[PDB]
Design a protein around this ligand. Sequence first.
Ligand SMILES: [Zn+2]
Length: 256
Amino acid sequence: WGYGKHNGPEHWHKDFPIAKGERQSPVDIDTHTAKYDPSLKPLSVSYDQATSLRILNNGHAFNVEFDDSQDKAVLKGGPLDGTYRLCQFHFHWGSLDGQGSEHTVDKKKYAAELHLVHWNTKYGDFGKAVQQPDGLAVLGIFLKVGSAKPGLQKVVDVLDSIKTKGKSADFTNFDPRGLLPESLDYWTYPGSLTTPPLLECVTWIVLKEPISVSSEQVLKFRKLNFNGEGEPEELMVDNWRPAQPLKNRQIKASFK
Ligand SMILES: [Zn+2]
């Protein structure tokens, strides 16, 4: 599977038939049909103790991986009834600034989208968690182009070293607090992973406020490769799945 004409999102259902299921992600957030829920609690993001390990080009994005052996980087509160440990974060982006996000807002696309991926500590480990409808919580954050995000620069600065599929670099001492906007206002709905295996295991929490990144910062994403070293160059752009049908799920918001 991939993001090409012959292996892209419109093909995934042939190997992963849940691609046409009832709680697929991403979705468009229609701000008129999304429901303000005053009962929605503030989100608790506790990343003070977050321990980054490595950054790697897995052939469809880059992932920063964390030590999730303890409650060092946990998401709780908001719509969640449990505690969720950060395993990895990655982004999706476009071939130009006008597209790249997975979620949309009133069908508007952003230049990129950051996903911080967390698993439910009821379930022992990540691989057990994804078998459960409440196994993961993904915090999604839109990227728009403007001022530079200082907290992203260490990520931008290492990407030249992981250009091709299978490359990795040590990536210690990275603090993901540097990737958060000021507000934790959010939309939330039940959904899925946005890549195969497309499991319907995710509580999605999508922040209202985008982070601003510079032109130069998002451009660096577009120099990565889907291919391995020595193989014909396939630039890693447009690694986003389009919005999928909401199918009567309720998107709730912490604001009107
Ligand atoms: Zn993602």
